[PDB]
């Protein structure tokens, strides 16, 4: 049965069982994953209103002396590029990328995006033809099966993933692995199928808008956002759009428990409706940079593609 | 069917025969590049580009009796496993070759039936790519994303003139959106008659999805010999970029006052839907890793079109 969202932890809501799965509110954590740091700022001014615990660290400034500026004085050379990329009234889903040579933290990559008066601010670290090899391949693949082969296998060859599936959905929402690469030794998950439970409804609709999601450490705790609510509206601040985004607890243990330090998935989006997801697993924890993880995007249209191309020959 | 090529003494194209040029097997290739053709086998080096010589600083007997193995050592193996006996000529492997004579060249190969076509351009070596990719994803209607895809070409590539020209069901054109260099025609919402890309050019646009030609007034290089060895018969040369124009397209450019060209094909459901068409008012010869931005782009056009047209229908 669908329900609506509880309010989160940190506004008194309840905690997350079996039983009440798809309405944990995982879009507005309050929280992100400790490999970057994000800043909120009004979308007109400039202020920043809200940035997570580690910022100092990732920005090599003091939380007041950051907090006491506008992105005009932080980014004198991006604030301007934003502005025009991201105007009024843009969708959350549209996002602009920059990388800085930031002094105490090397280089950084920037990743903005636009919700509502809020301006979101991602910084992360950040570091031949593969990708136009493996677009002629994907595309010379002459069925399906074939297809989702070259996938799997090419996305390991970039990533170094020690497991990539294809997870295909079902009309019911339950999927199935319909192709894998594997590294020695583990076993396989080829043909195997999961209750639709197993990815609920409030994820699968966010997963249809915001197309790569990621796991990094699936037993690093979260670091909240300071404040947690955003001063503008005394409300939470919408997350979803933040690959930051700390992950539901609910998720990492149940990856915990099937021995996963990582994990990344691309949506595969056809005729608008999450047709499966690029998932992927490491051992250990893993952190793949902001760059190899564009490859990916890109894969995920050029594969959203060929799906329809290869499932059309078919009837 | 087609006339045979002009150089096995076939008529001279005109406006009477447009369709029936045999553009695939002109014989010859732009000269910014290279083209060595080769044994799918042996590696033996069957045709060469007759300007050859300059790109790879090659005495030029010293060619056309030796070995892929023997003149690309790293590579031979690679394309061995990249384009196996039996695939489509469409398939394509790239790479980067530090190369003594010529800094970095750029290597581009296809397998047409027994054949290895090699082609040669000089190379080089951020985010606009990725920023692009969310704008066109995030245009509300079909002609908000022509303009963006429009706008990012031309800034990607600074082409005095970028156009999305649509076809219509008779392959009628129609230049939907337009990015231009102040002070040029515009030729937003003109139409122009099928005959213009005429039908043996369209079904090639739809399998081999860019081409070019770099500068409008310069004379193409003869492949030497210009038979394939093989078949004696004529290279198809549609899956290499370096393929010499046609001269009726060539002067269809010139007239226009144009000196540089590219396109890229739009397909969706099978059909050519349209292309990104670009014109340079001088020679312009766009590196390899540029067109392959633009060779994204394609698709990720060809997907949205799809998306944006759905939600009209
Ligand atoms: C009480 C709710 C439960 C629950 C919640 C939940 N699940 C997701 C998202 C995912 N679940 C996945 C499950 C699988 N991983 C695999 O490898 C396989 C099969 C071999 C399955 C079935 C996957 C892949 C995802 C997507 C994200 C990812 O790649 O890790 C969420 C949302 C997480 C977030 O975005 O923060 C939630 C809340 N899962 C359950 O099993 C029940 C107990
Ligand atoms: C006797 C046949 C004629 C003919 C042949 C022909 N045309 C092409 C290819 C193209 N024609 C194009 C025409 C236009 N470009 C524009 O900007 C406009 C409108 C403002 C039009 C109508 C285009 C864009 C192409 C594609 C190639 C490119 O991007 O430059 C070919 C094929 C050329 C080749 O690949 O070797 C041929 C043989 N054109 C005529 O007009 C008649 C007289």
Known sequence: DPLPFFPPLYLGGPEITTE???????HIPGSIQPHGALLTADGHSGEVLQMSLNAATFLGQEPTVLRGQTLAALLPEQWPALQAALPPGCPDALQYRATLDWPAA?????????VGELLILEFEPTEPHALRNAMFALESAPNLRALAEV???????????????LYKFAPDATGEVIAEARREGLHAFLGHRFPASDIPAQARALYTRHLLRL?????????????????????????????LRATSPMHMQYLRNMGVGSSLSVSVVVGG???????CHHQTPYVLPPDLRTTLEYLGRLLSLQVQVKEALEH
Request: charged share 15%; with cysteine; aromatic share 2%.
């Open 273 to 279: 409706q999450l047709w499966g997801l690029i998932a």
């Open 151 to 165: 996938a799997t296998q090419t996305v390991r060859e970039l990533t170094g993933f020690d497991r990539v599936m």
């Open 20 to 26: 009440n799965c798809e309405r944990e509110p995982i």
């Open 106 to 114: 090397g280089h950084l990559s920037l990743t903005v995006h636009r």
């Open 215 to 243: 796991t990094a450490d699936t037993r690093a705790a979260a670091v909240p956002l300071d404040p947690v609510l955003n001063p503008q509206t005394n409300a939470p601040t919408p997350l979803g759009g933040a690959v």
